[PDB]
Amino acid sequence: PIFLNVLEAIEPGVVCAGHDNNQPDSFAALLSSLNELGERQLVHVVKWAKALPGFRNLHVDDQMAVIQYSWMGLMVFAMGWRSFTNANSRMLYFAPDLVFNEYRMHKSRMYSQCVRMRHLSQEFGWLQITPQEFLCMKALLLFSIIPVDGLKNQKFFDELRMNYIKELDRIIACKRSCSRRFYQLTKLLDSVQPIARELHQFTFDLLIKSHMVSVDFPEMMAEIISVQVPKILSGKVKPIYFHTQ
Numbered sequence: 508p509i510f511l512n513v514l515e516a517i518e519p520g521v522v523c524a525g526h527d528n529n530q531p532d533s534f535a536a537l538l539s540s541l542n543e544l545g546e547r548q549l550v551h552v553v554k555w556a557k558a559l560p561g562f563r564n565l566h567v568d569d570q571m572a573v574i575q576y577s578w579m580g581l582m583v584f585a586m587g588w589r590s591f592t593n594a595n596s597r598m599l600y601f602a603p604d605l606v607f608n609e610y611r612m613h614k615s616r617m618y619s620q621c622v623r624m625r626h627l628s629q630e631f632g633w634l635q636i637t638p639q640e641f642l643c644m645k646a647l648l649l650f651s652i653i654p655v656d657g658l659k660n661q662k663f664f665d666e667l668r669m670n671y672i673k674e675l676d677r678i679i680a681c682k683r684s685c686s687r688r689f690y691q692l693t694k695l696l697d698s699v700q701p702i703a704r705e706l707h708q709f710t711f712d713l714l715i716k717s718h719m720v721s722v723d724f725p726e727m728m729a730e731i732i733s734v735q736v737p738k739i740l741s742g743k744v745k746p747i748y749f750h751t752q
């Protein structure tokens with residue numbers, strides 16, 4: 508099982524947010540900390556993606572683009588997973604030093620988004636998702652959002668995505684019905700996209716007004732959110748869904 512060996516080997520470790528838990532919870536502090544966490548995790552997601560089987564088959568411009576479009580969904584999905592394994596989805600485990608209870612969900616003014624994310628975390632429990640399933644699903648999320656007009660070399664992308672789908676199917680097949688399970692997992696993967704879209708909308712709006720509300724955006728975050736995220740929100744870049752929405 509070369510493929511699973513690899514996904515397991517490359518899986519990023521713990522990333523902390525740098526949040527000061529001594530200071531009262533305020534919108535500005537929580538969101539600055541989440542933004543900082545995003546920047547730190549972005550560094551890990553890039554090194555992760557670059558080490559994925561076949562990823563170097565993509566054109567270099569496409570390597571960068573798939574990361575830039577998919578990071579939100581990937582980070583939300585992994586955060587769901589950590590919340591499940593650490594808090595049993597009772598709280599959102601963004602980082603060891605940044606765990607949201609209901610009060611912080613309220614204070615972050617992202618309560619409805621946090622509800623959807625906690626629901627995804629709950630699905631990990633409800634569907635009894637295995638770590639191997641999680642790892643393959645996560646890899647497939649990197650290949651789940653692309654420009655409507657296609658990438659630089661779409662053929663390389665299509666083939667890579669195909670290979671990852673096949674890998675998910677094998678993992679299900681190697682389990683003690685297959686069809687139900689595949690249906691369940693593709694439905695779960697689809698459910699990440701609407702959550703990612705609401706956070707895309709939220710973060711874009713926040714960047715625009717960030718001076719006003721004293722929320723800090725680090726450099727990579729500000730740039731992707733103003734350059735790449737608007738492509739998604741304007742419909743130039745769209746998620747690939749398994750099932751019809």
Ligand SMILES: C[C@]12CCC(=O)C[C@@H]1CC[C@@H]1[C@@H]2CC[C@]2(C)[C@@H](O)CC[C@@H]12
Pocket residue numbers: 538541542544545548579582583586600601602706709710713
């Ligand atoms: C991806 C992050 C940070 C990484 C993580 O664990 C999930 C989480 C989901 C909400 C995001 C946050 C990064 C910063 C964002 C985008 C804020 O600007 C508003 C929503 C935040």
Ligand SMILES: [Li+]
Pocket residue numbers: 527528529530531532533536
């Ligand atoms: Li705090």
